[PDB]
Swiss-Prot record, chains A, B:
The keyword Metal-binding does not apply. It comes from Saccharomyces cerevisiae (strain ATCC 204508 / S288c). It catalyses: tRNA(Thr) + L-threonine + ATP = L-threonyl-tRNA(Thr) + AMP + diphosphate + H(+). GO terms for molecular function: ATP binding; threonine-tRNA ligase activity. Signal peptide: none annotated. Present with 1240 molecules/cell in log phase SD medium. It is an enzyme of class 6 (ligase). This is Threonine--tRNA ligase, mitochondrial. Pfam families: HGTP_anticodon, tRNA-synt_2b. Belongs to the class-II aminoacyl-tRNA synthetase family. The gene is MST1. Keywords: Aminoacyl-tRNA synthetase, ATP-binding, Ligase, Mitochondrion, Nucleotide-binding, Protein biosynthesis, Transit peptide. GO terms for cellular component: mitochondrial matrix; mitochondrion.
Length: 420, 420
């Protein structure tokens, strides 16, 4: 009879992922295992954004004076959902205004467009306490945020590149449970919007054209556009057929005008850049919640905070213990605190545990299966003899391999490398 | 006639590192190049903390209700320097209370001590505007924070391990301008402190003993201890002989008591853990400021946002251009946005630029030297003939090497691997 929210709480209790406290309602605590997943997702997304999709990361303030939010139009649209800060300040619910400040700080040439900034800042929104639900709706969350500044003729290609990244995430790297794991909502001009209505109709026309050219299924979603522009909202469906907004792409002609943004064009004319807002995960928190809704805790290897467990058949057998300890040390790849040798960059480190509890071998196994370890590694007398480990995958326990220490090292590397 | 603050602003203007805006006084903006350095430092420290010094990273809320800060004793000690948050809330100036909440959420056995949590959360402190200076003193900053929960008999070894990490940073990996690049301030009981005076004298005795055993030079620093315990403050001296507090280690018997923290001991007795607070960089921002004070912008290779520049002698020569472009593509190691192949984990990517501006070769060189590129790579007709690049290091321009594409790839790898 379980809901998505309940599924998230069940997995979190089994794997020690997260916790909450009434001293900070709506703000999640990521415990070590929960934080490993969070950080892994961010590592993945940073790699795609920097070395494939042309983004440059920036780090921006969390609080801005009341004036910035008035200049942006946030203060009169959202201020009820905005935490005020007191010494006249607003705790940011969005990164965009900060990125406008960065754009307008230097002369900009058409030669550096499209200019793409990424930002993983924590955001706060004063969501009503009745709206709070697990990791899907929080008062504090992290967006894989990004703002693009381009020319009219670059809009289409930039949006298709955003859509390519979206497909890598939703239709290639991550399984979820249409052929596509999402549909698009075409979200149009809302009641309260800034800017002239002509510009708005043009932005909506550009977006519809791109939607049609993409060939992806979409739905009209009237009135749900941002206050600064219309958007494509990427909707995924949980197992209770309820839809959730994750990735989003927003076409913004309005903020550039309000920040008096300009760039020198090919003809030495000063012209306004167009701004595209975009997020792929949406928020890392909500994305994680939807992964869990699908995988029920059975993380893929590269993401799993429980990548492998090593289990000696006899916990008092020295030959088995040595062999198990040798492998754990190899796969964890840690250094001793006793010397001055630092951990080098780009080494591999795997989440590998050793269960030597004074418990029947059978129960230790069952324990590891409850935790969803990607791999179970057993060592008995025969394994000591061959100096080869019995290793089997979680979701295919019937088959198995007998591999050397070195072969497991390379196997785990290839898995993590390519997001298996 | 330059000050540290002025040096930071000069380097930042030359390398496009940071920016400020009056809409958010005391909060820094990290531009792409500035953010690269910031992120590199955090990557380095995470590796040491997770895979050498036994820390587990957590991610905690930024805002807590007034009650938490009252329970911790922060609200009556610091509340003037605390940004309040309004819907009864405090924007955190410290992570400790959150970590106490995490400790007390589960039954804890003596078997999991020392328990070590790390946290890179953004912190805010309402510093007086007259105290704001470059990156050394801000209203928003990131600590490489960490809290250790141990038993009385573990205190010494834990503090020596903290000191080992401090030496790796200040006396091995990073040059700065005593043999050691810091001295220690023994900071003692301040006017306003929580807890009984007997416990306080004991904490100070334990610390002095450890200080004496370490053999490191220290100075009495009366009254400057935290309100929860005495501390060892690691002081570095800028080139104007002014001292700055960076790393710190704080011995805390007090917070555990106020959060009713307990763990089951060897004898099934419930006992209070001791808490050690510690930071190595102090804040990433202030550490960066002190690096800049020393290096004057001449970053070591692994940290440099300008790792190499490739300069064709003749910008209209196709043979030279091809050879230059081949190398840039190799070293950057990017993927095209046009396919579904993701950037894999643990690949190498170098910050390598190509200067093909229509400018005399001589001036393009001079330009790169102004920016402090770690390596200058020149390609003329002879280099095309040999298919070998003329590569020279920044701080040793007189000598040079002629290397193939492959040899530069491996060279740059070895440099970044081992923090050269
Ligand atoms: C995309 C940005 O550039 C733009 N300023 C923006 O904030 N768009 S948004 O309002 O639609 O937010 C983007 C994503 O953040 C996620 N999100 C929004 N609110 C919350 C919340 N209260 N809790 C968790 N995630 C949220 C959603 O997935 C949403 O699609
Ligand atoms: C070390 C923590 O666990 C403890 N709660 C703590 O905050 N100690 S601290 O107050 O001494 O802060 C640690 C380091 O942060 C840095 N820091 C403190 N205030 C600022 C500031 N306003 N701007 C930049 N860095 C700061 C200093 O380097 C300082 O040594
Ligand atoms: Zn935005
Ligand atoms: Zn602390």
């Amino acid at each position: 009879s379980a809901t998505p929210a309940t599924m998230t709480s069940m997995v979190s209790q089994r794997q020690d992922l997260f916790m909450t406290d009434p001293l900070s309602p709506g703000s999640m605590f990521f415990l070590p295992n929960g934080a490993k997943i969070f950080n892994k997702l961010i590592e993945f997304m940073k790699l795609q954004q920097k070395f494939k999709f042309g983004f440059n990361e920036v780090v921006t303030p969390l609080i801005y004076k009341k004036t910035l939010w008035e200049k942006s139009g946030h203060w009169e649209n959202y201020a009820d959902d905005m935490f005020k800060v007191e010494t006249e300040y607003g705790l940011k619910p969005m990164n965009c205004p900060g990125h406008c400040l960065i754009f307008g700080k230097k002369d900009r040439s058409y030669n550096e467009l499209p200019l793409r900034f990424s930002d993983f800042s924590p955001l706060h929104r004063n969501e009503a306490s009745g709206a709070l639900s697990g990791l899907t709706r929080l008062r504090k969350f992290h967006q894989d945020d990004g703002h693009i500044f381009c020319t009219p003729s670059q809009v289409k290609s930039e949006i298709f590149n955003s859509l390519k990244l979206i497909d890598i995430v939703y239709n290639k790297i991550f399984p979820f449970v249409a052929e596509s794991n999402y549909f698009i909502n075409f979200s149009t001009r809302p009641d309260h919007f800034i800017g002239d209505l002509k510009v708005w109709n043009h932005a909506e026309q550009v977006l519809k054209e791109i939607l049609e050219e993409s060939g992806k299924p979409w739905k009209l979603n009237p009135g749900d556009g941002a206050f600064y522009g219309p958007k494509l909202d990427i909707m995924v469906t949980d197992h209770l057929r309820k839809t959730h907004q994750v990735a989003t792409i927003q076409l913004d002609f309005q903020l550039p005008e309000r920040f008096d943004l300009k760039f020198k064009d090919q003809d030495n004319s000063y012209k306004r850049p167009i701004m595209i807002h975009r997020a792929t995960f949406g928020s890392i928190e909500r994305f994680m919640a939807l992964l869990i809704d699908s995988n029920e805790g059975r993380w893929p290897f590269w993401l799993n905070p429980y990548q492998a467990v090593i289990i000696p058949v006899n916990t008092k057998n020295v030959q088995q213990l040595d062999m198990c300890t040798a492998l754990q040390k190899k796969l964890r790849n840690e250094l001793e605190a006793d010397d001055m040798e630092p951990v080098p960059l780009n080494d591999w480190h795997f989440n590998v545990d050793l269960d030597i509890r004074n418990e029947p071998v059978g129960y230790r196994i069952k324990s590891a299966i409850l935790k969803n370890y990607s791999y179970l590694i057993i060592v008995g007398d025969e394994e000591v003899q061959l100096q080869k480990y019995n290793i089997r995958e979680r979701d295919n326990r019937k088959s198995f391999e007998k591999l050397t220490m070195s072969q497991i090292w390379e196997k785990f590397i290839e898995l993590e490398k390519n997001y298996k």
